[PDB]
Design a binder for this molecule. Structure first.
Ligand SMILES: COCCCC/C(=N/OCCN)c1ccc(C(F)(F)F)cc1
Ligand code: NA
Ligand code: NA
Length: 499
């Protein structure tokens, strides 16, 4: 079985996964909409009562399974719980990242394409007024994606956008086919520094942004000025818990696959706590210092609420590009921004697609080449649904991330900490650990963490269970994916009986 070479690279790859577009875009929006600086109160608590405990568990399950030559949840759940229902629930952790990858890699290709178009100067040039600046870029994005003009739910992406997607896939395969250490870990040692440099530079250039409408100081002002009156809203505490899941990448079975390449007695306590902190630092220090400030600096603090309500996607694919076409040398700033984003996603997309690569290796005994080429084949095929069918992207995100963070994460708790046994579990986490997990966390892992995860589920349940016909096309496919994966798991246990 393959293994991580260095402890540094391990943390960088785990952080590589955790840090992506959400750190720079999603997180700053959630904070401003939910109390600003006051949002740091429930966010840190959730980091301590949910994020950190659950992180350690996925690291534990991974290493525990990796020592037995299994990196995925269909096998691992069957090791924590000798049952048929454990193998089925395990498929979900093979299904979730595979669904995300069907849309995630494609959006990752957008950043790359934009980065290319921005670098060569193939971008709109306005013209005055805010809608006169945004519209040439709103339309720039819509022509790349192929946003439907008529009533049809049909997208028509550009040939270029399609070609960049093919290139993005090829890049992923390039890194992935070289393996854990010589591919992912090697690239994680190059990307993360390159990422940090790009962030710092953008942070610096943004703080220098001065327009007649405002400054960057007004941006960091609006974003971080605490509104404690919003702490009364349960929805703020719900968003915070949800944000931590999203921030750390919990409930997608990605960590579990990675940790399974960590050796039997190597530390997972301190190593995890490090990679987790790197992401949080990247979010609060770098991510919340670029997007929102630059948005407020150009449009003023008067539109700061409107900007945050416009969503994270508009902020990063329309708003910020439009601001860049108005600043000195902003076309290169557009390129550094989209190249910052491209790497952030790429370090995540190679991480997520590994689970399916691991399965084909560990359970179906496929070579690494075949495992990558078929995984690439599957994600490439399924992506055509995202590329051509309008709102298919949303349906996949809803089901994958929805079930992923709200169902499957809780399942990891119960199986490992309630079915497999809390004491046996606790030893598996602390074993070989440089530092030991605080004795208080035993109660947080066993009660507090699943109690929260139950509530996040239920509130999510009570709102989304009640909440067009073409959505069935996407549902039809992703269900077909689950059946397909059940079948592979089925074939996996039948090959093992023969040998
Ligand atoms: C809402 O956008 C999708 C996020 C799902 C979780 C995500 N975490 O990555 C870094 C944490 N912020 C993720 C999961 C799977 C994949 C992959 F596409 F690689 F499977 C990529 C990102
Ligand atoms: Na993150
Ligand atoms: Na990443």
């Amino acid at each position: 079985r393959e293994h991580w070479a260095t402890r540094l690279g391990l943390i960088l790859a785990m952080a590589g996964y955790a840090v992506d577009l959400g750190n720079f875009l999603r997180f700053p929006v959630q904070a401003a909409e939910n109390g600003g600086g006051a949002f740091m109160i429930p966010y840190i608590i959730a980091f301590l009562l949910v994020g950190i405990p659950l992180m350690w568990i996925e690291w534990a399950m991974g290493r525990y399974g990796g020592a037995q030559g299994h990196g995925t949840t269909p096998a691992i759940f069957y090791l924590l719980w000798r049952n048929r229902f454990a193998k089925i629930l395990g498929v979900f952790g093979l299904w979730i990242p595979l669904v995300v990858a069907s849309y995630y890699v494609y959006i990752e290709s957008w950043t790359l394409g934009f980065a290319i178009k921005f670098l060569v100067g193939l971008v709109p040039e306005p013209p005055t007024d805010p809608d006169s600046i945004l519209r040439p870029f709103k339309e720039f994005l819509y022509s790349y994606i192929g946003v439907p003009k008529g009533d049809e739910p049909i997208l028509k992406p550009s040939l270029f956008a399609y070609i960049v997607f093919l290139i993005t896939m090829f890049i992923n395969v390039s890194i992935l086919i070289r393996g854990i250490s010589k591919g992912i870990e090697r690239f994680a040692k190059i990307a993360m520094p390159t990422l940090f440099i790009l962030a710092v530079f953008l942070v610096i250039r943004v703080f220098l942004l001065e327009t007649p409408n405002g400054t960057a100081a007004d941006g960091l002002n609006f974003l971080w000025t605490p509104d404690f009156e919003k702490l009364k809203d349960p929805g703020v505490w719900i968003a915070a818990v949800g944000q931590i899941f999203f921030s750390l990448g919990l409930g997608f079975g990605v960590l579990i696959t990675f940790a399974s390449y960590v050796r039997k007695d190597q530390d997972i306590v301190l190593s995890g706590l490090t990679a987790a902190t790197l992401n949080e630092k990247a979010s609060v220090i770098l991510g919340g210092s670029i997007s929102i400030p630059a948005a407020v600096a150009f449009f003023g603090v008067a539109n700061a609420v409107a900007i945050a309500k416009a969503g994270a996607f508009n902020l990063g694919f329309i708003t910020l590009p439009a601001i860049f076409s108005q600043t000195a040398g902003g076309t290169f700033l557009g390129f550094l921004w989209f190249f910052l984003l491209f790497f952030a996603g790429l370090t995540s997309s190679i991480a997520g697609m590994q689970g399916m690569i691991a399965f084909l290796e560990d359970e179906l005994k496929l070579s690494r080449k075949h495992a990558v080429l078929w995984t690439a084949a599957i994600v490439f095929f399924s992506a055509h649904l995202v590329m051509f069918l309008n709102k298919s992207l949303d349906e996949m995100d809803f089901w994958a991330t929805g079930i992923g963070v709200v169902f499957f994460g809780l399942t990891e708790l119960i199986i490992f900490f309630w079915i497999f046994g809390a004491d046996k579990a606790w030893e598996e986490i602390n074993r070989g650990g440089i530092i030991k997990v605080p004795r208080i966390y035993y109660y947080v892992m066993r009660y507090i963490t699943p109690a929260f995860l139950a509530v996040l589920l239920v509130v999510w349940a009570r709102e989304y269970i009640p909440k067009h016909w073409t959505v069935w096309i996407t549902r039809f496919y992703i269900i077909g994916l689950f059946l397909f994966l059940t079948f592979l798991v089925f074939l996996a246990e039948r090959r093992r009986n023969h040998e």
